[PDB]
Amino acid sequence: MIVSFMVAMDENRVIGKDNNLPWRLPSELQYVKKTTMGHPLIMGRKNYEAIGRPLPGRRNIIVTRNEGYHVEGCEVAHSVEEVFELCKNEEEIFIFGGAQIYDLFLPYVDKLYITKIHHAFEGDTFFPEMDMTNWKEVFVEKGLTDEKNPYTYYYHVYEKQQLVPR
């Protein structure tokens, strides 16, 4: 099972402002949709609510410690272990964010899908630091910038850098 972080952050790792995206890049979200199609999406409650709805064609799994938390059209999981069991037969799952949610899955991550937005926004929550010497880029592509997607941004994908033995 490939454990993948899915993330869009600015030049200071901002991933949110007052629980919402400080940017509006529909093309970027079209990319998330295309990339995650047919795979589970894993996200925290706060993250999930910051959207209002669930993405069709995707297994939405909400992670909260709240044992009474339910939402229609979604699954709820209360620990890392419960998510892995639930996703036991899946080839790839996408950790869809919450800083804390990313942190929960750090010891397990195999793949990084990182959108980097070339701008500094006002933010209050951040993509956790990561030592990238352990990682190797396998794909990059400049996003579509135009009237609907004002900012300049790049899709990046990283896999684990294999170490060559001494």
Ligand SMILES: COc1cc(Cc2cnc(N)nc2N)cc(/C=C/C(=O)N2N=Cc3ccccc3[C@@H]2c2ccccc2)c1OC
């Ligand atoms: C705080 O608000 C958000 C945060 C995140 C987290 C996130 C976004 N992008 C990337 N690359 N990584 C992330 N972890 C998503 C979202 C996603 C928003 C959102 O509305 N969508 N994001 C993806 C998606 C996937 C399947 C069905 C529908 C959607 C939907 C969408 C909207 C417009 C065009 C195409 C698809 C979000 O809401 C705006």
Ligand SMILES: [Ca+2]
């Ligand atoms: Ca793995």
Ligand SMILES: [Cl-]
């Ligand atoms: Cl969250």
